[PDB]
């Protein structure tokens, strides 16, 4: 994997109308993967490696958590949101990869963590260090058991 | 002074839509992370994050399941993103240079 760098000219002509994003590191990123539980998530290790690599190459300092219970996820997401580093970074990233249902994801113990509770950890009241800073979340998890059969193309 | 809503400046990418399953390949991994890594590595230099998630939506829409003799053969998925961002989000990778 390689990440093509932007040009100085692209920066100069776009930074005024964008979130400030120049800190080194650009932010902390957290990649939390659950694979063993809700069948084993084969290929889940490829996703995890790929994102760790991606986010480092994008200039993030990456923290990783693997195979955590719902309660561990909540406690550790809370610890991550409260890190002091957030005051001197310009952005934040959280990727959660697991099984899930609509609005929640599973811990390895088969219990559920609500996504609203996650987003709340990082909001303007609970995480003042990230106020006005862009916060990205990528959630790889089912939102239901319905398989989409697809439709023809008319 | 200016105050803030309780929650703002977030963007959330979802692998699939409300009510539906997200798809994962046993060797290549998840369709959504595979697409996101391709797009970001390649377009972060010149495209904002919300626009890169649109590109990822394009890739996900055209993919289909390969799993003969199961309910997943030729199945589909659609990714989405939700945004409370208030500006362009450009990651400016590798600027300034070393």
């Amino acid at each position: 994997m390689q990440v093509k760098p932007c040009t100085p000219e692209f920066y100069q002509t776009h930074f005024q109308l964008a979130y400030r994003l120049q800190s080194r590191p650009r932010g902390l990123a957290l990649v939390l993967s659950n694979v063993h539980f809700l069948e084993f998530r084969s290929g889940g290790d490829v996703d995890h490696s790929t994102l760790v690599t991606l986010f480092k190459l994008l200039g993030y300092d990456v923290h990783v958590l693997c195979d955590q219970t719902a309660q561990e996820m909540q406690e550790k997401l809370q610890n991550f949101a409260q890190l002091p580093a957030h005051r001197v970074t310009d952005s934040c990233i959280v990727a959660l990869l697991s099984h899930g249902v609509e609005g929640a994801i599973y811990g390895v113990d088969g219990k559920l963590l609500q996504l609203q509770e996650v987003f709340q950890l990082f909001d303007n009241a609970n995480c003042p260090s990230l106020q006005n800073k862009p916060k990205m979340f990528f959630i790889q998890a089912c939102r239901g058991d319905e398989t989409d059969r697809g439709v023809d193309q008319q | 002074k200016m105050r803030l809503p309780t929650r703002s400046d977030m963007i959330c990418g979802y692998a699939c839509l409300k009510g539906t399953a997200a798809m994962r390949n046993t060797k290549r991994g998840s369709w959504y992370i595979e697409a996101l890594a391709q797009v970001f590595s390649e377009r972060a230099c010149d495209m904002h994050v919300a626009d890169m998630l649109v590109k990822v939506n394009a890739l996900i829409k055209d993919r289909e399941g390969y799993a003969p003799g199961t309910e997943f053969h030729r199945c589909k998925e659609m990714s989405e993103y939700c945004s409370t961002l208030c500006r362009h989000l450009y990651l400016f990778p590798g600027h300034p240079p070393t």
Partner: peptide, 4 residues
């Protein structure tokens, strides 16, 4: 391919 399988489901998450």
């Amino acid at each position: 391919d399988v489901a998450d």
